[PDB]
């Protein structure tokens, strides 16, 4: 089909934004060890919201890209509106760039004033630092986008793949409405904040990623739609059975009742299972592959995604999910380590996977790229992926020493925050080095196009 | 074992647990007045929360262990800088003197806060430290 073309600007923008994201990562990583670097021009927190908002926005773009590509091909018709996909692309790209420029060009409190945050205060919450107008604007794009892609499912074939995608997509936008909800009570504010963050990334986003994985497996493997769609349902069943009460592993120390200690620890113990199943999924359906596929990279992206998401979300998640352990590690470099690997392995990787599949045939080049371009992709994959295991190993070592020095001993014996950080310096240099190997991988991946 | 079987497991499991979760939510919600001492949650502390947000403290600090890992935990800073009695006075000095300009040290910004604002901040932080947090953090260092 031809309206599948509108997915191209989405994937290309996502990759540009991904570059931006890494650059601001590298700025913060230097700030860790040369504390006054770029100060007072770009204080750490400004660099941070740029890094974290570019991460969320680029992945969102990748998701819309992924939908715009596979939804026509599942629905067995043209996308409801190629021209809507294009207005929406430009609106979303303008709002992203505008709010990012806001961050860098006006001190945060000033940006707050300037956007009339006093009337509807939603600003200055982690991952939610965008002005209420930006948030409001993001909802409108979501509505447009949902109408566009969801009309296409309505007037066409319904497959489980597209159904599950739509459910994830709808749930993502719905839960985003909680960002408009900013309670005056601190623990209430934190309680509802996780309905965005956790119910996305360990719930509704897992539906999106499963769907994209399943579609790609269908197209690369020639194994029967029926079995693939069955496992999809198993995987997402396990995601929401573990993950919904699972939200409780964020409810240990925010000020909610101690029953969450049990509920959070026990349901979370099971949250690795869907990622384990995605590894059995991709590995099995790829080795029971009824055919060969001219693009060997997609197959690698798909297996890699599942192994990394399982390491990052599953193993690292579990490693700190039990309350008696989380008590010591909560809000520590361990958190940053888990967070980097989980976000990269599950979500950055599944976006690059669908791009691997969809790019050559969006650029009317065919199923696969020439065999020189295919080895670059593979190099940028090993470079990005290995670099990230190193990033997470160094931050893991950092968090272990941080917990040992600062969290374990009693008052008097425990080291102070700033003193502990100086002791961690070497781990932060290494992470920065790894962050350099990663950019090199991203450039290598980019130069494969 | 069929697709159909798998889809109904998905359906039932998710509705059941969606409902379990809301019931727990409702309950939790009713306990919050006591756990968080909402009696003390004055106009001053609610304005402090606004200052906290308006300046993105959380982009550098953790509060109750959530936020950024660049700078110290502020949930229990009260106890490490002169307690109930003198914390407001400390904070007033603390916000004025920034940045400290020690070469190579992690820097905090000058926020040009008025003293009303800094006082509201202090009340907010003081109140935060008194939330029943199931005894988190482990010690006075946060």
């Amino acid at each position, epitope marked *: 089909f031809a309206s599948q073309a509108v997915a191209k600007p989405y994937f290309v923008f996502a990759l540009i934004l991904f570059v931006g994201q890494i650059l601001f990562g590298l700025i913060m990583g230097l700030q860790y060890v040369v504390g006054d670097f770029l100060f007072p021009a770009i204080p750490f927190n400004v660099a941070r919201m740029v890094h974290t908002n570019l991460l969320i926005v680029w992945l969102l773009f990748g998701f819309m890209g992924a939908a715009y590509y596979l939804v026509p091909e599942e629905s067995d018709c043209e996308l409801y509106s190629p021209k809507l996909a294009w207005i929406l692309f430009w609106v979303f790209a303008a709002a992203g760039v505008l709010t990012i420029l806001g961050y860098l060009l006006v001190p945060y409190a000033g940006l707050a004033r300037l956007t009339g945050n006093e009337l509807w205060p939603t600003m200055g919450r982690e991952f939610l630092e965008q002005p209420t107008i930006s948030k409001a604007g993001i909802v409108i794009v979501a509505l447009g986008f949902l109408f566009n892609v969801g009309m296409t499912v309505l007037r066409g074939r319904k497959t489980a793949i597209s159904m599950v995608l739509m459910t994830g997509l709808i749930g993502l936008a719905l839960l985003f409405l909680f960002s408009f909800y900013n309670p005056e009570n601190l623990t209430r504010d934190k309680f509802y904040w996780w309905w965005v963050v956790h119910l996305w990334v360990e719930g509704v986003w897992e539906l999106i990623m499963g769907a994209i994985l399943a579609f790609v497996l269908v197209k690369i493997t020639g194994v029967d739609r029926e079995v693939i769609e069955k496992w999809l349902y198993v995987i997402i069943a396990m995601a929401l059975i573990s993950g919904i009460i699972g939200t409780g592993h964020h409810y240990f120390w925010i000020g909610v009742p101690g029953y969450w200690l049990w509920l959070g620890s026990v349901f979370s113990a099971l949250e690795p299972l869907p990622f384990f199943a995605m590894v059995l999924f991709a590995f099995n359906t790829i080795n029971r592959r009824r055919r060969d596929y001219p693009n060997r990279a997609v197959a690698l992206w798909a297996m890699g995604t599942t192994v990394m998401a399982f390491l990052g979300a599953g193993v690292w998640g579990f490693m700190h999910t039990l309350a008696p352990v989380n008590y010591y590690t909560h809000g520590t470099q361990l958190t940053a380590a888990h967070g980097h690997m989980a976000f990269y392995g599950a979500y950055a990787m599944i976006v690059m996977t669908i791009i691997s599949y969809a790019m050559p045939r969006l650029r009317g080049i065919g199923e696969a790229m020439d065999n020189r371009s295919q080895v670059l992709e593979m190099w940028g994959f090993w470079l990005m992926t290995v670099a990230m295991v190193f990033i997470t190993l160094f931050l893991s070592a950092a968090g272990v020493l941080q917990v040992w020095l600062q969290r374990m001993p009693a008052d008097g014996a425990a080291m102070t925050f700033m*003193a502990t950080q*100086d002791q961690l310096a070497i781990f932060y240099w290494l992470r920065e080095g790894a962050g350099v190997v990663f950019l090199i991988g991203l450039v290598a991946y980019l130069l494969s196009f | 074992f069929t697709k159909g079987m798998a889809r109904n497991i998905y359906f039932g499991g998710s509705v059941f647990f969606i409902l379990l979760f809301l019931a727990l939510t409702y309950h939790t919600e009713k306990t919050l007045p006591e756990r968080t001492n909402e009696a003390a949650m004055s106009a001053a502390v609610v304005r402090g929360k606004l200052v906290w947000e308006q300046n993105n403290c959380v982009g550098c600090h953790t509060l109750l262990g959530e936020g950024a890992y660049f700078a110290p935990e502020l949930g229990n800073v009260v106890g490490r800088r002169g307690g109930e009695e003198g914390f407001n006075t400390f904070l007033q000095a603390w916000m004025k003197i920034q940045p400290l300009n020690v070469p190579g*040290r992690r820097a905090m910004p000058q926020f040009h806060l008025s003293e009303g604002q800094v006082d509201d901040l202090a009340e907010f932080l003081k109140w935060s430290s008194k939330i029943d947090t199931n005894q988190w953090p482990p010690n006075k260092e946060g």
Partner: antibody
Amino acid sequence: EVQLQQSGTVLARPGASVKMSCKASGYSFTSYWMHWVKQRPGQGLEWIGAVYPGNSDTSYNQKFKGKAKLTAVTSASTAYMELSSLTNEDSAVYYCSRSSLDGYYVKNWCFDVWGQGTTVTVSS
Amino acid sequence: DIQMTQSPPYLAASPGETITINCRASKSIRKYLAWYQEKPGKTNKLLIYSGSTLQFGIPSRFSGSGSGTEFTLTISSLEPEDFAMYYCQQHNEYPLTFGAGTKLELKR
């Protein structure tokens, strides 16, 4: 309340050695440089050196490299200074003091708490 | 080593008056100069650091300024407890060094 409690007056013969202590309370002993400072009467303060109990590293004024040895015992929050091969010129008050800022890389800063001083009288 | 000259060495003044005392450094110490107050039977008390930053708890009648090479300390309206010995210390470079002091005396 941050306090530094120094040991009492010591008398020694020329060429001998002397060891004094500084007992720290009310803070994270391992998170701050301990400084030592010499004052002979009508003579202006002189910085001898410092020890970082968090890793045992030390730093000495070139003028005191031979003279002074600094150590710390972390379980007791006590810092120590040993002065060797004494001379009339080592008769003085000796202060310990805590860096006002925590961490290893603030070695050259100012001090916010001082002990009351240990007198060393070198005489025959 | 950077050497430090305080002047004057003695200054007589009265309660309610304003004085200002000087500190000079033999080379640039950027802005990094602290002041201590010394009194008999009390431990030395940090007053100002980084040239003009008041230390927590110190009354606002004390202030200081300077950079590079020349620094001053002012007390705005002398109080009885301010008659004391004052030392400056550079905190820009190894090895730390101190001025020899200005003694502020009660005029009668």
